[PDB]
Design a protein around this ligand. Structure first.
Ligand SMILES: CCCCCCCC/C=C/CCCCCCCC(=O)OC[C@H](O)CO
Ligand SMILES: CCCCCCCC/C=C/CCCCCCCC(=O)OC[C@H](O)CO
Ligand SMILES: CCCCCCCC/C=C\CCCCCCCC(=O)OC[C@H](O)CO
Ligand SMILES: CCCCCCCC/C=C\CCCCCCCC(=O)OC[C@H](O)CO
Ligand SMILES: CCCCCCCC/C=C\CCCCCCCC(=O)OC[C@H](O)CO
Ligand SMILES: CCCCCCCC/C=C\CCCCCCCC(=O)OC[C@H](O)CO
Ligand SMILES: CCCCCCCC/C=C\CCCCCCCC(=O)OC[C@H](O)CO
Ligand SMILES: CCCCCCCC/C=C\CCCCCCCC(=O)OC[C@H](O)CO
Ligand SMILES: CCCCCCCC/C=C\CCCCCCCC(=O)OC[C@H](O)CO
Ligand SMILES: CCCCCCCC/C=C\CCCCCCCC(=O)OC[C@H](O)CO
Ligand SMILES: *C/C=C(C)/C=C/C=C(C)/C=C/C1=C(C)CCCC1(C)C
Ligand SMILES: *C/C=C(C)/C=C/C=C(C)/C=C/C1=C(C)CCCC1(C)C
Lengths: 294, 294
């Protein structure tokens, strides 16, 4: 540690004395991060993630910028974890006694908006983004900022900022859901609709797990230890980023093959909220005005 | 303060003893935030900003969501400053001795992307955003994340993260410049082109001042004190947000009046990098294919 770890209790445990060496001191910081079993598990999941993220980068290496940016950051993340995981400021040890994993929240700020940009162009064919895309990004940034602030805070201040994060988060989840519904009815009828369905399940489950891990972790009720929280977070990271990004590359190849073999043939379908989506079709026998009541 | 402020030096200044009351302690945290003159100046500029931001909200209150979101956050910001400016986590007092103004960086994360979204639709007429818009947002988020990490860090770690912020920042500034060039040649020939020119000056000067205030502040070489840094930051805040947002509302009204009186009549002008922009014109005697060599 690069904070004070050696001290003496004096006067029946009522006074703590430390070397006057310029280092900060706090008992709360010295609480254990967890068991050796938790530590072993965390280093394994990290290695798996560093390696798999590096494989994904090379694999994608065989437009497309979103999968690479996230996979690059995940890799960079491990080297910092690997060398300085518990060094400030990968973990912030603050005057109120909290341990805040800035690396995680910073990583979310780097990667989550890019995932949402990817989500807004699942097929990869669009060159533009609507107004709703922008709201998705702004709501998500706020979620992380409130969540980070909550983690840095204590008591009632933590609770309030968490709840604003929850309000921002619901708005994010709701609009993400809207995007996936449009995407499902946009992509061709076969395999493309299977992949999109898989991504929705992956997305809502993995992203939905995050507020839960927060509540359980040191940032909430301290059920999970620091290592415990790391293991959980790396799991849902693999889901939310690596696996989801894999599917996204796969989905985009499938969309590309469809347009190469069949060309870009569109049919307008309307979904009655009442939304309209231009579905990709396979042959020119369809170019009509189809609908679908929900 | 809610950290330890009372201590005794023992053994010829080599041992510090504190009450064992659970509070964290560090000498670095107790350094003064600055002179009383600096404090007075900071409270004045904050009040000016709280009031003026509230005026802007009501004033805009007489599409348009970007001016309100930023002005709302600025207002909320002051109430937190007003009640808990130097309470954790508005300022983070970390184990490495740094004081990091999380409120500022968090505020930047909330407001700067929205300013850039506004910038990407200065006229307010567009319903879509290109790929380049998305890069603008992603580069800017990275800047803040690296800058925040640099502020939280020390020594060579601070320097590296600052430089990545600088690389991200240049990419942001460059693309912002691209947007303003397109915007200038898009808006009508008269007053609209004056306002856009004003915004470019405001934008690059106020945003450009931020890395400079960083280098001078406690986050860098400690030339400026904490209060000193606050005063500077509130000034360029008024420029980057309040004044710029004012012009943006004004610019959008002017664009709206043009389309109401004259309708939406466009002419394609091409700018030889070679870029094409559809300029708004006043009468149907222009609908041609004009160009302009740079
Ligand atoms: C994400 C979109 C779908 C929403 C589903 C969300 C997942 C579960 C959240 C649940 C209830 C909120 C719980 C609020 C309590 C949190 C307060 C806290 O963290 O505890 C602080 C306290 O000071 C320490 O003792
Ligand atoms: C923003 C786009 C246009 C670019 C214009 C930028 C404005 C000026 C930046 C300049 C040089 C960079 C200076 C790099 C030195 C910073 C390192 C530092 O902060 O000092 C840490 C040290 O450890 C404490 O003693
Ligand atoms: C680690 C195994 C995961 C926890 C198993 C329960 C246990 O006690 O295992 C401890 C053993 O000494 C180690 O494998
Ligand atoms: C394989 C090594 C992985 C190093 C990280 C990225 C490669 C991204 C290319 C841009 C270079 C950035 C490297 C960096 O450290 O920033
Ligand atoms: C997002 C980037 C995050 C964490 C910043 C990287 C972690 C910085 C820690 C570097 C450090 O100070 O390590 C000193 C070493 O422990 C001497 O023994
Ligand atoms: C807490 C919920 C607040 C949700 C904050 C998310 C705001 C998203 C947004 O700004 O959307 C603007 C919309 O287009 C307006 O016309
Ligand atoms: C405050 C005035 C800004 C600094 C003026 C220089 C000065 O010394 O003024 C101190 C005086 O006591 C107070 O006005
Ligand atoms: C005038 C009071 C200003 C209070 C802040 C915002 C109004 C924004 C309307 C949404 C309500 C959010 C209020 C909040 O505190 O979050
Ligand atoms: C972005 C939001 C930021 C700062 C969070 C708000 C600042 C939280 C400080 C509240 C607090 O703990 O105040 C205790 C008071 O000082 C008892 O005397
Ligand atoms: C450090 C400079 C790195 C700049 C990081 C900014 C990346 C912006 C971006 O992702 O743009 C993607 C582009 O569209 C690709 O096709
Ligand atoms: C790669 C990392 C990802 C996809 C992280 C996602 C994180 C979230 C969806 C976090 C959500 C939260 C809330 C819904 C409420 C406030 C607490 C948070 C930040 C954990
Ligand atoms: C309302 C707040 C605004 C507009 C803040 C803008 C901040 C910046 C443009 C900061 C830029 C930085 C760099 C260019 C390099 C790294 C250090 C920063 C974060 C100060």
């Amino acid at each position: 540690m690069l904070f004070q770890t050696s001290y003496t209790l004096e006067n029946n445990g009522s006074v703590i004395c430390i070397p006057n060496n310029g280092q900060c001191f706090c008992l709360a910081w010295l609480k254990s991060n967890g068991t050796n079993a938790e530590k072993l598990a965390a280093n394994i999941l990290q290695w798996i993630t560093f390696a798999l993220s590096a494989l994904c980068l090379m694999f994608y290496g065989y437009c497309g910028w979103e999968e690479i940016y996230v996979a690059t950051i995940e890799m960079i993340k491990f080297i910092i974890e690997y060398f300085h995981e518990f060094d400030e400021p990968a973990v912030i040890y603050s005057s109120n006694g909290n341990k805040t994993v800035w690396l995680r929240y910073a990583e979310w700020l780097l990667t989550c908006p890019v995932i949402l940009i990817h989500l807004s162009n699942l097929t990869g064919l669009a060159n533009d983004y609507n107004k709703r895309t922008m709201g998705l990004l702004v709501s998500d940034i706020g979620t992380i900022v409130w969540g980070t602030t909550a983690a840095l805070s204590k008591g009632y201040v933590r609770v309030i900022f968490f709840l604003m994060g929850l309000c921002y988060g619901i708005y994010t989840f709701f609009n993400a859901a809207k995007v996936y519904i449009e995407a499902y009815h946009t992509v061709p009828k076969g395999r493309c609709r299977q992949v999109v369905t898989g991504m929705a399940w992956l997305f809502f489950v993995s992203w939905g797990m995050f507020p839960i891990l927060f509540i359980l972790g040191p940032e909430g009720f301290g059920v999970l230890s620091v290592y415990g929280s790391t293991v959980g977070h790396t799991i849902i990271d693999l889901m939310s980023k690596n696996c989801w990004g894999l599917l996204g590359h796969y989905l985009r190849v499938l969309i590309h093959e469809h347009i190469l073999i069949h060309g870009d043939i569109r049919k307008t379908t309307k979904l009655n909220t009442e939304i309209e989506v231009e579905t990709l079709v396979e042959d020119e026998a369809e170019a009509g005005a189809v609908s679908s009541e929900d």
